[PDB]
Structure formats: structure tokens, C-alpha cells
Ligand binder design. Structure first.
Ligand SMILES: CC(C)(COP(=O)(O)OP(=O)(O)OC[C@H]1O[C@@H](n2cnc3c(N)ncnc32)[C@H](O)[C@@H]1OP(=O)(O)O)[C@@H](O)C(=O)NCCC(=O)NCCS
Ligand SMILES: [Mg+2]
Length: 228
């Protein structure tokens, strides 16, 4: 099938990026030796997911011109990319995906996949602002689980943010606004950061523009920031 993450990478960015995805855990994918301590005591389902996602990452790197390398885990769980590379990883039920780019062209990337299923009201209240719960249902087509799409967009926001700030970003630290395309299955979002927006260097992260998509029972979101 066609790759789902394509739908949330706009033309302005897609040619600076490489990506790969899978919808299962193929047998005989293996970790690189350096990675094995990370999943040595993990349950098989996590072990295999980890392996598959790292495999997608190396396939994408390969497309970028980067030889296969181990991808370790940093201090706050972030992937350790090779120098000169930025990227993002995501998994959920029925999806494993990776997007990478060269850091000379791409400042940061965050992606996230979720099942297109409802969230509990308890979760919705923890991850949303009162104003989002008022605004989004009007912006989004009936039938979309906009609670999950919101949640997915917030997680993508953190992933694009952390490599540029090395600071925490909570769910109530960004206000997300949505629009829907005519298809009703794709659209844009903007995350407005509500805390100190300063990057470690360069321009501040004040308003982050992303894309969302619903297809094959999945929500995909992505934010891509280019180097200017
Ligand atoms: C870490 C988190 C963002 C992961 O998102 P998720 O949708 O639950 O799970 P995903 O499978 O999509 O993503 C997991 C991957 O995120 C990546 N990740 C973890 N921490 C990260 C960080 N600090 N920066 C960037 N990427 C990170 C990892 O690569 C991980 O996979 P791996 O363990 O195989 O290497 C999420 O679990 C979380 O804890 N969020 C709290 C922060 C947040 O979302 N704030 C909202 C800001 S508006
Ligand atoms: Mg997710």
C-alpha cells in the first residue's frame, strides 16, 4: 500500500525528507548489536516493535545516504540520530514509522501515530484546554475522533520541540487549532506554545504548523520545521 505518513508531509518539505513504515513486525528483523541491551529484558511485543521501528529508521536513513548505524536512546528517551541527521519515530497498534532529514535543511521533525479510536473523558480533560474542547468540534467533521487527533497532534508537538529546547512541554502548554480539508480526512493544525518559547539557539518556537490525516483506521500527525 501507499505510505500513510506521505499525507502529512507537505510538498514544501517532502523532498528534504526520507521515510519508511510497516504495519506489523516482520520476522527476522534484528537489532544492531549496540541496541540489544535496550530491549534485553523487554517483553516480546515491545522488543519486536522496537526492532521494527529501528529498521524503518535505517531504511529511511539509507534513502538519505546514511549507512546503517545503531540508534540508541537518550536521556529523555529521545532517539540518538547520527550527527547531521534529525528525525522522529512512532508506533501504535498496526503501525511503525520513521521520518528523517538532513539537519542542514531540516531543523526538526515530530511525527505521531495513534489508532483512530475514542479516548476516555478523563484522558481528554488531562490533555486538552477548555478552549480546545469548545473550538475543535466546530472545526472538525462529524465522525472524526477529534479527541484522539488532538492528543496525537500534541504528542507530535513535543517530539519536534524537545530536540530544539531540551525542555518539558506539557499537554496544557500548547493550544492547538485545527482545520479540515474538503475530504474530511486530512487537514492542518497550529500549535501555539504557551510557555517560554525560546529554543536553545535560533528563532523561538511560538507557532508550529502541522498536518493531520485519518486513514486505514489510524491517525497520523507531523510537524516539520525547516532551517532558514
Ligand atoms: C514520549 C511520547 C511523546 C511518545 O509518544 P507516543 O504517541 O506515546 O508513543 P510513540 O510510539 O508515538 O512514540 C514513541 C517514541 O517517541 C520517541 N521519543 C521519546 N522521547 C522523546 C523525546 N524526548 N523527544 C523526541 N522523541 C522522543 C522515541 O523514539 C520513542 O520510541 P522508542 O522508545 O522505540 O525509541 C509520549 O509518550 C509522552 O510521554 N508525551 C508527554 C509529552 C507530550 O506529549 N506533551 C504534549 C506537548 S503539547
Ligand atoms: Mg502515538
Amino acid at each position: 500500500i501507499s505510505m500513510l505518513v506521505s499525507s502529512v508531509l507537505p510538498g514544501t518539505v517532502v523532498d528534504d525528507l526520507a521515510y519508511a513504515e510497516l504495519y506489523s513486525d516482520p520476522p527476522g528483523l534484528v537489532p544492531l548489536p549496540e541496541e540489544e541491551p535496550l530491549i534485553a529484558k523487554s517483553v516480546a511485543k515491545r522488543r519486536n516493535e522496537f526492532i521494527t521501528v529501528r529498521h524503518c529508521a535505517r531504511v529511511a536513513l539509507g534513502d538519505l545516504g546514511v549507512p546503517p548505524v545503531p540508534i540508541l536512546k537518550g536521556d529523555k528517551g529521545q532517539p540518538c540520530w547520527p550527527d547531521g541527521v534529525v528525525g522522529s519515530l512512532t508506533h501504535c497498534s498496526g503501525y511503525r514509522g520513521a521520518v528523517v532529514g538532513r539537519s542542514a535543511a531540516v531543523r526538526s521533525v515530530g511525527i505521531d501515530a495513534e489508532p483512530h479510536d475514542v479516548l476516555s473523558n478523563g484522558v481528554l480533560d488531562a490533555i486538552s484546554l477548555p478552549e480546545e474542547r469548545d473550538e475543535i468540534p466546530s472545526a472538525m467533521p462529524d465522525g472524526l475522533h477529534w479527541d484522539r487527533i488532538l492528543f496525537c497532534a500534541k504528542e507530535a508537538t513535543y517530539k519536534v520541540w524537545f530536540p530544539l529546547t531540551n525542555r518539558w512541554l506539557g499537554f496544557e502548554d500548547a493550544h492547538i487549532t485545527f482545520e479540515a480539508d474538503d475530504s474530511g480526512r486530512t487537514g492542518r493544525f497550529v500549535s501555539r506554545i504557551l510557555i517560554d518559547p525560546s529554543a536553545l539557539w535560533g528563532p523561538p518556537l511560538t507557532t508550529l504548523h502541522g498536518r493531520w490525516s485519518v486513514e486505514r483506521g489510524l491517525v497520523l500527525t507531523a510537524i516539520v520545521l525547516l532551517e532558514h
